Structure formats: structure tokens, C-alpha cells
Ligand binder design. Sequence first.
Ligand SMILES: OC[C@H]1O[C@H](O[C@H]2[C@H](O)[C@@H](O)[C@@H](O)O[C@@H]2CO)[C@H](O)[C@@H](O)[C@@H]1O
Ligand SMILES: OC[C@H]1O[C@H](O[C@H]2[C@H](O)[C@@H](O)[C@@H](O)O[C@@H]2CO)[C@H](O)[C@@H](O)[C@@H]1O
Lengths: 399, 399
Amino acid sequence: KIEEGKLVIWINGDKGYNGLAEVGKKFEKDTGIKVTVEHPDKLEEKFPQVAATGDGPDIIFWAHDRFGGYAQSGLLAEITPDKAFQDKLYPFTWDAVRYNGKLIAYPIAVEALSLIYNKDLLPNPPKTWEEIPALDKELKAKGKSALMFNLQEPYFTWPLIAADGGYAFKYENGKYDIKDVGVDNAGAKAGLTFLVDLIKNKHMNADTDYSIAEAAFNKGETAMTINGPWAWSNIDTSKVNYGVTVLPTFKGQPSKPFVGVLSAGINAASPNKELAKEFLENYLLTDEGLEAVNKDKPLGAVALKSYEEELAKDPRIAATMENAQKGEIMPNIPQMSAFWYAVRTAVINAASGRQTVDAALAAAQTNAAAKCNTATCATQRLANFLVHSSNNFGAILSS
Amino acid sequence: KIEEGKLVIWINGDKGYNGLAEVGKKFEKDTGIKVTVEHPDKLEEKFPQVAATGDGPDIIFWAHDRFGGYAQSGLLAEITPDKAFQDKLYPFTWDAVRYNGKLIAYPIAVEALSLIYNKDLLPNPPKTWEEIPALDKELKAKGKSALMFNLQEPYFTWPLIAADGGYAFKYENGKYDIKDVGVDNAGAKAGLTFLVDLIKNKHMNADTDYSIAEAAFNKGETAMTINGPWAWSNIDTSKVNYGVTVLPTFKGQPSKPFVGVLSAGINAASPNKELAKEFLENYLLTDEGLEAVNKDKPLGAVALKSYEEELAKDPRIAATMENAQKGEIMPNIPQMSAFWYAVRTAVINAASGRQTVDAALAAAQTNAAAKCNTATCATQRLANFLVHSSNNFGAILSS
Ligand SMILES: OC[C@H]1O[C@H](O[C@H]2[C@H](O)[C@@H](O)[C@@H](O)O[C@@H]2CO)[C@H](O)[C@@H](O)[C@@H]1O
Ligand SMILES: OC[C@H]1O[C@H](O[C@H]2[C@H](O)[C@@H](O)[C@@H](O)O[C@@H]2CO)[C@H](O)[C@@H](O)[C@@H]1O
């Protein structure tokens, strides 16, 4: 099924897969082990479909939120980095890759969405969501729009939904209560209603996706976009004069983006687990390896202390971490797949006008929530506290 | 050594030891086992001395702060209640009696100090410490005084010392740094200076102890005192019309009392551990058992949910919990002994004029601070997070 003496890697197509392929080439040059990097469509859905019967890649990269589900299904090898290696990465990042108390992936970098704006069109970007409609009116008369971002993935709309009170699964006292979903409270309704009204009032199009928003911003047709570190390098090439800053407030509250830790897991069925460990620990998670990936598409705030110290002075990373501090770490519980699936459908149905905000979010609450909560082991409860600790996250924040 | 076929219990003399002896009589009726309740002076210092020689009581009652030291020293038997019993008490109270992964006592009640005032002498209690001098001046002209409280035990002066920034051990990210004490910072100096100034300006006396303050308040000789729930029954008998309220603010900041969980530990040297467990679970931690103790001297907010629901109606308990929310849970680390010794010494020396506030607190820092910072095991780091969770604690104060 999976080939012995070689490595296959899956990583998302928005990441620096060519940079990662360069790291694979250095690995092959030094060790003779071929590394093949692929970026399949819907890889986060395909992985569980293929790993169950011993197929799929040796190493899978994704934000940490999906890994709990994968671990629960028996798809991931427990990783065993030694103490000396663990000490090289920020503790917070290790805490984000624990499931049932075991380390189930190597953390790579911390991601959060920021407001990206065209400094020539918009020297003083808006501090609030409320002022965007008027900004869009002014710009439309000059042949431009105010804001375009991916409306097809709920990750991008979440910061606005969470701003005034929306939440996924209630986190409290080291545990996530899967009975208690906050996608249909007053805050979530207010946030999604604001988005839907932007669309009704012709300030945004319900069909806008990642590629459309990126092309619009990068060609100078829209003054702002919402995106993560990975997007910066294409903007660099476009020569649009851009800034990266704090997301706008809504009802006076900060936007609250979900925080992701890009992570690399090892397939439980891989016969190359030690080659995977060697590649990840000794090639990728080095200054040189991370630089290779980062130069392709920026990673955000990297888990490796030594390299983060170099990246810390970048204002764009400062903005990323400011937005992250205002947001919250994604849960990694197996119920996250159902949550994302339910919220994606609700946002698209409401933005399209097929459903009211209230009906869409009521359905999403029902479909995301479990009927009753379950047990959390002590080592995991500790991990949960640690990823909710500002002082723990602060080790990276100050860099 | 400890006598087999009998239970000796130690409890502090301010508590309901006669009520506890009544629970003992019921135990004796059912089991044939005589229960002797004693209330030795400075029992929290005597226990570790006598228990280290295999002597002492079968069961020791004290606030949870001293129990980490006792457990570390090997003086306490591990508690293993079954899930059915555990579910009867608030989780937070169990979390307070964990030490390095083991339950080392049965929790009984949550204690915090409050401001107690004579409503006939003082209908409107002061919101600030700063207004007490002027208040004392008016009352001295009427043959009374404003405030008397125990200045001999640092437990009672700590809320003022901590108000403007004083702290015991620096607490961050689930861990205490025992090298970093806050008994000699600007906030601690300000608080102790204010107390010492009250004495210098003849608004308080340095020799005022527990007995002097209680007698003066209950005989109507002074207008206010500072004390815990246990004191309310003697005030009831005195017929003084009293209120229990929030502690005064200092420099605009809440007074921060240390919160204690009265707990019952089993002596590791006891040959009666199974009897002691049965006494505690099946006789004391019942509605009827806690009622007997509480009717003698109030316990505070009890750990037993069924009885706390019955006591939550009392405004004096609400006040106790408001003060606790403003304060901090006591650490249970072994170094707490040295901390209390250090602050006890400083307050007495400053109040007597034996040393200046600065010199006393300089010595306290040296006496309280460890030479190095020990590790924190993962189990205790978790318990630390749990006892600092406002949602965890909130389950009680909602009652
Ligand atoms: O939209 C739901 C989606 O959100 C997150 O995915 C992000 C990912 O974390 C970023 O690295 C990036 O590639 O954009 C994605 C959104 O398109 C969750 O990680 C994911 O599981 C979820 O389905
Ligand atoms: O004053 C230092 C002393 O403070 C605490 O003791 C309290 C105790 O918690 C209450 O239950 C009560 O009886 O009043 C005591 C003060 O007299 C700490 O628990 C203790 O270890 C410390 O020595």
C-alpha cells in the first residue's frame, strides 16, 4: 500500500509546497530517501477515507483542529520526540497537538487571519466593520470595492461571527462541552446578519471564493481582503503596496479569529515512521528548512524558537499574533468535522438568501452539537488549559 | 503511638468541635468506636511535629494550604472515594485537596474573611480602608472604637497587604515560582504601612488578638471586626445587630483575602484509616453531620452540594463568597509554611515598632523565598489550573 524506504507528503495547496519539496530534495541528497510532496484537493477529507485501509501519505499537514478526529479513528502514529527536541519548539505549540494526552503531530507554525489592505487605495484602513458599507459606496464610484474575502469557507467569516459572542463548543475549566454550541446565540446571529446585509446591500457577492478574492486584491480592484500569512508572497509579486493589520471591530468588540497550528502527522499505517521522524525533526524543523518553506509561502509565527526570533521583527507577524491574541485556539475534538460542515452550510445558505440567518444558524446548532458531553483525561485537560493560557501563548507573542 | 479501635480528631478551637463531637456520638452508636475531638493550640504546627514521629490524631482538620506540605512529608494517607461519593461534593473542593496526583483529604467547606459591622453603631459600613481613621475619631468621642481584628495572625492582615499588589509566590501558567515572592513590593509596603499608621495614629493596638477583637465586637465596644463564618454564632448569642459585607477597598482596589478549603486529612500513621474514611464519608459529609457542626459554628460554603443548596439562602454566605471571588485561593505548596512564618514575623515586628515596614518586609522576602525553583509535576499543574478557574469555583458561589 504505502511504499517502504520513501516518503509521500500531503500539504494544502495554499501552503509552500514547493519550498517543502526543496527540503525533500535536501533530504534525498543527504540520505538517498526520495520525498514526494503532493497537494490533493480536499486532502483533509481524503486522508481519513484512504488511511483507514492503510493507504494515503506517510505525512499529512493540516491545521491542528482535524487531528483529534484522525487520532480517534486510529489514523495517526504517536510521535516520540526526545526532550532535547521538544525544548526547541514553543510549549504552546506542543500543547495544541495533544489528543487523549498523547502527542499526535509535530507543530510547525501558528496561523491567524488579519486584515490586509491596499495602502494606496486606503491609507487609513477602517477600525470597525460598521464603516465598511460607506467605504464601499465611496469606492464603487471610483471603480473599486471595499472588501473581498472567501465566503465559501466558514474559517474566514468566523472572526465576525465570534466578535459579539459566537462560539463553537463552550470551552470552560479545561474542557469543551460538546452539548453547548454557540453558533446560534445573539452574538453569532448579529455577526452573520451583518455579513448577509453587506451582501443584500451589494457591498459583497455571496459567490466570492478564495481565488476570486485573491485576484481582486492582487490586481487592485478591492481595497481590502481577509487572509492568512500564506497569502503574502503572492501579494509581494503583485507589487500592490499592502499593509497587514488588526481586524475590524464589530459592536465595539474585537473580531475573534480561530487560531490554527499547522501540524504534521504521521500515518499509523506508514512503514516509514522513523524516516518521517527524521525528516520532520532534522530537516524541516530547522532554521534552513523552515526558511525554505517560508520563502515560498509564509508560515506565520513558527514553532521553532530559533527561527521565530528572526521572524519576530516582521510587522506582518506582529499583526498576525495581535489578531491571534484577540481570537481563540481551535478545538481539536473529533466533533470539529461536523461543526465545520454545519457552519459552512449555514453561512452559504444565509449569504445566498436561501435561508434566513435564524433558520440557518438554528440548524447548524443542532447539527454541530452532541446530545451529551463525554470524559476528558487529565493529561488532555491540562493541554486544554495550556492552549487557553495567554501567558503560555505569550512565549511566542513577544518572540 | 496511635491507639487502635478509637478515633482522635484535631480541629481548630474557633470551629464547631462540640457539633463534631455529636457526629462522633452517632458514629460510636453504630460502630462501637469512641471518637474524641480535641482542639490543641497551634495545631497546624503541632501536627507535623507529632505526626512525623508516628503519633497524633487519626484525623486532622485544617485549611487545605498546610496539607501539601503534610502530604509531601508523607504524613497523610491517600483518599480514594468512589465516583458516587465524589459526585456529592463540588469538583473545585476536591481540586483544592489534590497534591501531586493524589487526593490527600476530604474537603468540608470554603472559608473567606468578611467585614463584620455593628448596625446600631454604624448603619453604613465604609467602602474604603482610607475612611476608617476619621470614623474611629468620631467613635472614640462616643466611648467606642471603629475596628478591631486579630493582628497576630497574618491571615487577617493579608487582605490589606495584597490589595494594592502584594502576593505570596508568583503564579503563572499553572505554576508557582517559589524564588519570586511579592511580600516586599510597592503594594505590600503600602498595605502594611497603612496598617502600621492606624496603630501609630491610635486607631488600633498592636497587641489586639482574636480574643480581644471578638470580645470587643460582641460586647458592643467596637464597631467592626474582620472574621470568618465560624465567628457568627457567638455574635448571634451576643444579640449585637450585625451585618456581613464586602471588605473595604484600599487604593481603589479590592481587599484580597486568601481563600481556604477546610479539609479533613487522615494520618498516614493511623491504624484506623478505614474507620476514619467511614466517619468522614458516611457520618460527617452528610446533610445531618454538616448541620450538627454548622449549628455549633458556621462552616462557610459547604463542599456537600445537597447541604450548600440549603445554606445558599443565607446573605452572610453570599458575602463570604463575594470576598472569596475578590481574593485568591491559597497555594498548597510546602513553601507556604515559610511564607506564613515570614509574614507573621513581619507584621508583628512592624506593628510593634520593632522594625520599620521596609526592613520587616525586606526580611520577609528573604524568609519566604526559596533558594531555587523546584519543578511542578503535571498532575499538580492541572490542579493549579483547576483551583484558579473562575468557572470551577463558580459552581459553588452559584450554589
Ligand atoms: O473553513 C473551515 C476550515 O477552516 C480551517 O481551515 C483553514 C486552515 O486552517 C488554514 O490553514 C487555511 O488553509 O484556510 C483554511 C480555510 O479554507 C480548519 O483548519 C479546517 O479544518 C476547516 O475545515
Ligand atoms: O495566619 C496564618 C494562617 O492562616 C491560615 O489559617 C487560618 C485558617 O485557614 C482558618 O480556618 C482559621 O482557623 O484562621 C486561621 C488563622 O488564624 C492558614 O490556613 C494557616 O496555615 C496559616 O498559618
